[PDB]
């Protein structure tokens, strides 16, 4: 059977399973990759928080939070605390274009979790609020 790049539909029954569970039952790792910080929260499919880790909660301060290594460490910490609650497979939902967009996922993988899908949910207004003016540096 040809691999489908598209995620499974909740309604349409599918045979894809991960440790016996359907796609819509897998825990979700929400990564928020800001410009100066990366925050990772693992939640259950029913939206029950299991683990949380940010670059600041891992000891990094000021500019050191906005690096790849800090996001990787936060990912490892989140993956460890999620492993301690029975999480193996995760669906990654990444929001933002910060330096830790990919390093947090790397840290999650090195912490033992298996990523089955990647979703981007970066906020894109259809021209709502007015952004701030450019910096005159």
């Amino acid at each position: 059977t040809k691999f489908s790049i598209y995620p499974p539909i909740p309604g349409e029954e599918s045979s894809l399973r991960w440790a016996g569970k359907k796609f819509e039952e897998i825990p979700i790792a929400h990564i928020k990759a800001s410009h100066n910080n990366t925050q990772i929260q693992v939640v259950s499919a029913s939206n029950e928080p299991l683990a949380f880790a940010s670059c600041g909660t891992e000891g990094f301060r000021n500019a050191k939070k906005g690096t790849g290594i800090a996001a990787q460490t936060a990912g490892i910490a989140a993956a460890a605390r999620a492993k301690q609650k029975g999480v193996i497979h995760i669906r990654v939902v990444v929001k933002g274009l910060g330096p830790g967009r990919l390093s947090a996922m790397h840290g999650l993988i090195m912490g033992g979790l298996e990523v089955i899908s990647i979703t981007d949910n970066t906020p894109i207004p259809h021209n709502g609020c007015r952004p701030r003016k450019a910096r005159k540096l």
Partner: protein, 126 residues
């Protein structure tokens, strides 16, 4: 504005360098410039602005292979103008000087010295 004819015809410096380095890394993080550039995985070491703001030298780390170095150099030189345009269009800086991609080989000395130091004989007590 008759485009056919147009085509036919210091503390501040350090902050600007840091800003430009971050912006250039973020530009190279995606296929925004080009897929061919994205596939090469270029890493930048630093950004240096000339004292009179006449050029922006972006020092990129070289690899060991020479054919890959030449290809990456060609792609970077062909993509410099587009990256300048993107930097000015995103309003990271209102005016950006021409971007010059310069090779960086400083780490070669440390690498080779450590390679030899691994096999060197320091005798008793190291």
């Amino acid at each position: 504005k008759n485009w056919l004819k147009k085509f036919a015809s210091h503390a501040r410096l350090r902050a600007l360098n840091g800003l430009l380095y971050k912006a250039l890394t973020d530009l190279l993080c995606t296929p925004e410039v080009s897929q061919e550039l994205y596939d090469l995985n270029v890493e930048l070491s630093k950004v240096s602005l000339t004292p009179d703001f006449s050029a922006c030298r972006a020092y990129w780390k070289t690899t060991l292979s020479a054919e890959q170095n030449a290809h990456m150099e060609a792609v970077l030189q062909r993509s410099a103008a587009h990256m300048r345009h993107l930097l000015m269009s995103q309003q990271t800086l209102r005016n950006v000087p021409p971007i010059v991609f310069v090779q960086d080989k400083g780490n070669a000395a440390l690498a080779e010295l450590d390679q030899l130091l691994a096999v060197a004989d320091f005798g008793p007590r190291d």
